[PDB]
Chain A
Amino acid sequence: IYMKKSYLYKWYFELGTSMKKFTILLYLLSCSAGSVAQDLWSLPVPDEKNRITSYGFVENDSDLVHGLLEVQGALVGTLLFRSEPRDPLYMMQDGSCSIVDQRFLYETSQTDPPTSIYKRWFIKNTQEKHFELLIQRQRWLRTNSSLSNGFFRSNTRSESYQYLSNLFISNGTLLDRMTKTLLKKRWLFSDEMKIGFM
């Protein structure tokens, strides 16, 4: 019950070389059950008044879930009923990125007037900021318009949350006695954990 004073994503990925595709599902299930427990055991119908926005491990859990979902959706190319929509420009980007990686690893109106008409009237580098701004705006519009892979992960996490809620409903007494044990005894190790699993 006492606060503490961060990079668990990289250790799991570097320790996993030929891991299973089913353990990703278990990692996602284990990284998203605290939110299920908090939403369950908090009493309903305030206007979301007792939520605990922007603290330590919720952001880390969300980041880990997003990373696991990205890893699972980028490695699809039975276990899963369906697959990702697979935007028809992904293979060009992967091929070009692999080619570039292998290549890397294989090593104001001109105030002076013109005396001749051959010379220009405005300097070539006068309007470069406007061109860059237009290019950046066009690139932003193009990139932020083709995310067809934002609704599959939402429903995947939705089914994960529904299963976690349905499982935690049956074992509500377990979490009850467990959080009471954490309430009285200020620390909770694995021995007390397994004893309270009764």
Chain B
Amino acid sequence: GLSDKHHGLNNFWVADRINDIDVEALRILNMCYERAKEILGRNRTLMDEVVEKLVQKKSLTKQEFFTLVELYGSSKPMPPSILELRKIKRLELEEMVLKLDMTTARNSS
């Protein structure tokens, strides 16, 4: 039900839609594989440093691994969480409803 093809709807009757259900899984798999490939190609230097440390030490803790991530990482823009989206949508809703308020008031007054 997390798919957005029609609206969730993981059940159908005719053969065409049941056949098309499995195609979306392949499309999501390919999109995720391409995203993983792009992310992996972005961090080849961090790749090399951490793999050398892994063959040299056979075990890595949080501190040193995150230190190497900080030294050799790229930009990782975190998507906004629920709270920021709620706040921007709330301010947008308030501003458009007050826009409706003047477009009613000065048109009426």
Contacts and interface: CB of A to CB of B under 8 A. Distances in A.
Interface of A: 130, 133-134, 137-138, 141-142
Nearest to B15: A141
DSSP class of B's interface residues: helix, strand, loop or mixed?
loop
Interface of B: 10-11, 13-15, 18, 21
Given A137-B13, A138-B15, A141-B14, 10 more contacts: A130-B10, A130-B11, A133-B11, A134-B11, A134-B18, A134-B21, A137-B18, A138-B18, A141-B15, A142-B15
B103 to A, nearest CB: 48
Contacts of B15: 138, 141-142
Nearest to A133: B11
Contacts of B21: 134
Contacts of A142: 15
Contacts of A130: 10-11
Contacts of A138: 15, 18
Nearest to A130: B10
A74 to B, nearest CB: 28
B36 to A, nearest CB: 13
B30 to A, nearest CB: 20
Nearest to A145: B15
B67 to A, nearest CB: 21
B34 to A, nearest CB: 20
Contacts of B10: 130
B65 to A, nearest CB: 14
Contacts of A133: 11
Q: Which of A130, A133, A137 has the most CB of B within 10 A?
A: A137
12 contacts: A130-B10, A130-B11, A133-B11, A134-B11, A134-B18, A137-B13, A137-B18, A138-B15, A138-B18, A141-B14, A141-B15, A142-B15
Contacts of B11: 130, 133-134
A138 B10 CA distance: 14
Contacts of B13: 137
A141 B18 CA distance: 11
A133 B15 CA distance: 13
A18 to B, nearest CB: 45
